[PDB]
Write a protein that binds this ligand. Structure first.
Ligand code: FAD
Ligand code: A1D8F
Length: 503
């Protein structure tokens, strides 16, 4: 049926090849290209699905060529920017597929005077922050703190970080974009239309096309911002009461302050729960300390725990570069299962302790992170982008268990079973109808698409609404509309792709 030799002929006659663009199985570099941006090591096993070829475009025509031949020869495309997909959806598929790996499409053009930047979709967050800092210490972009994450995927799913309470998600700060649609057309915001421009900014662009570039609204930051990354003992009542106050106030304090939490256990053996709190305050240390005295005296934050620095240098601090130049952010690994939830009402202290108690089963390799919402996030409409979890959401909670990848599926299954049990435990206390899920914390467990029988688009939409309303609440229905208009034959699909309505 799908002749892979004809497909390869199609590729090589439509992609001229002197930089290497097409990587085949017998190419030794095929595996390093493949492996180099697999972040979740579960999916790097030789027994994980493997692309027939990997395409590293240098030019849009390479992408257009790939879309043409993949359509013509029945190949599925997986687009990869930073490779951080929790479930590896950018480089695994259960059908014959090619990866379009955008690592060479990482040009960034920052313009200080317009406070904007064109960013090719293969750039990483660290590359974006470096390029902004190159030009201004007073400009920023609201995105995440992991420097190796691809900007294509992070904005494609929303993009939260320390500036979100001040300026919203990365997706809330996109002025324009370039995308390749299923017809191979290069479209920007005007030519793609507002609805597709909406969908790719948080709706999972893999469902709709291939984003080549974003035009980003840069945002102002003071020359001095303050960070801390503070460890506390959850056995101390003041730390328990801090967490109690964090649940009720972290989304309400001064928008310039974002305090994340992280809980883990630590090791006659005694096991304890370490509670770590890491923050960026977009301002000076004296304002921070008096804010913390008013709002969170329970943390006992010390002036000596605070560190003032330029905005871009906080991503050194928050990635444990505390000895190093900003150039470390130009450097573009374990297996894990992660799950997450949005919290809309504070979790009573006893339940919170019980949830923490589950970490006693996974000392040192399981982590519960808390991320505050509110602030600017409450002022953004639930339909402004596909990300719907704005006002009414207090914080996001993120569960993660990690392990060394040794190709042992029994190890994997135990960890996944543990995290699934914690997630089930959490069900009554987190959002419901839908169980709010951040798309960038991708979780196939919340539901996937029809694979066996995809002939009824009514049934596809119904099945997809299960995971779809969890990621997007009522934005799911517009996403379906956009999918219907922009990719009616459903060329761009994966395990959790928006399905089109069909006749
Ligand atoms: C591993 C990791 C993830 C993080 C980290 N920190 C984050 C943070 O501080 N804030 C966040 O909001 N999210 C954080 N994340 C999560 C990442 O944002 C998500 O995991 C992103 O989806 C990852 O994006 P990327 O690194 O580009 O991963 P990919 O696997 O390449 O893509 C994910 C997904 O999106 C599709 N896609 C990517 N790029 C495109 C383009 N250009 N066009 C269309 N579709 C695209 C992929 O096909 C896939 O479906 C910190 C860490 C360590
Ligand atoms: C800053 C957040 C991301 C944090 C994050 C993290 O701390 C660790 C990892 C990770 O090591 O995986 C391997 C991945 C991550 O995404 C985004 C929160 C989203 C909300 C508030 C809707």
């Amino acid at each position: 049926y799908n002749n892979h030799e004809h497909f390869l002929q199609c590729l090589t006659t439509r992609i001229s090849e002197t930089s290497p663009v097409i990587y085949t199985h017998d190419d030794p570099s095929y595996f390093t290209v493949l492996n180099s941006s697999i972040n979740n090591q579960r999916f790097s096993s030789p027994s994980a699905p493997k692309p027939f070829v990997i395409i590293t475009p240098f030019h849009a025509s390479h992408v257009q060529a790939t879309v043409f031949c993949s359509k013509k020869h029945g190949m599925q495309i997986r687009t990869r920017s930073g490779g951080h997909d929790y479930e590896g959806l950018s480089y695994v598929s259960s059908v014959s597929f090619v990866i379009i790996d955008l690592r060479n499409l990482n040009l960034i053009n920052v313009d200080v005077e317009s406070k904007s930047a064109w960013v090719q979709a293969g750039a990483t967050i660290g590359e974006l922050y470096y390029r902004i800092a190159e030009k201004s210490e007073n400009l920023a972009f609201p995105a995440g703190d992991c420097p190796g994450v691809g900007i294509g995927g992070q904005i494609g799913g929303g993009g939260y970080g320390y500036l979100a309470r001040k300026y919203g998600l990365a997706a809330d700060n996109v002025l324009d974009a370039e995308v390749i649609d299923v017809k191979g057309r290069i479209l920007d915001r005007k030519s793609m239309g507002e609805d597709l421009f909406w969908a790719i900014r948080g709706g999972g662009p893999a469902s709709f096309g291939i984003v080549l570039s974003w035009k980003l609204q840069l945002v102002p930051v003071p020359s001095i911002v303050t960070v801390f990354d503070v460890s506390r003992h959850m056995e101390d009542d003041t730390t328990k009461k801090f967490v109690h106050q964090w649940q009720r106030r972290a989304d309400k304090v001064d928008e310039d302050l974002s305090i994340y939490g992280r809980f883990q256990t630590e090791s006659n053996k005694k096991i304890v729960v370490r509670a770590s709190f890491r923050a960026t305050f977009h301002g000076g240390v004296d304002r921070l300390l008096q804010l913390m005295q008013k709002e969170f005296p329970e943390l006992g934050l010390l002036r000596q725990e605070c560190h003032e620095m330029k905005w871009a240098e906080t991503f050194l601090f928050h990635n444990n570069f505390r000895n190093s130049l900003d150039v470390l952010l130009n450097r573009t690994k374990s297996s894990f299962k992660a799950k997450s939830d949005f919290v809309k009402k504070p979790i009573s202290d006893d339940i919170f302790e019980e949830m923490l108690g589950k970490l006693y089963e996974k000392v040192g390799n399981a982590f519960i992170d808390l991320f505050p919402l509110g602030g600017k996030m409450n002022e953004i409409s639930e339909s402004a982008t596909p990300f719907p979890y704005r006002a009414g959401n207090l914080y996001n909670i993120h569960y993660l268990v990690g392990w060394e990848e040794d190709g042992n599926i029994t190890t994997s299954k135990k960890h996944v079973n543990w995290i699934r049990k914690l997630y089930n435990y959490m069900t009554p206390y987190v959002s419901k109808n839908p169980r709010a899920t951040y798309l960038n914390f991708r979780d196939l467990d919340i539901g996937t698409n029809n694979k066996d029988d995809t002939t009824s688009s009514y049934n596809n939409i119904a099945r997809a609404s299960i995971w779809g309303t969890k990621y997007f609440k009522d934005n799911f229905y517009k996403l379906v509309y956009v999918k219907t208009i922009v990719d009616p034959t459903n060329f761009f699909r994966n395990e959790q792709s928006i399905p089109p309505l069909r006749r």
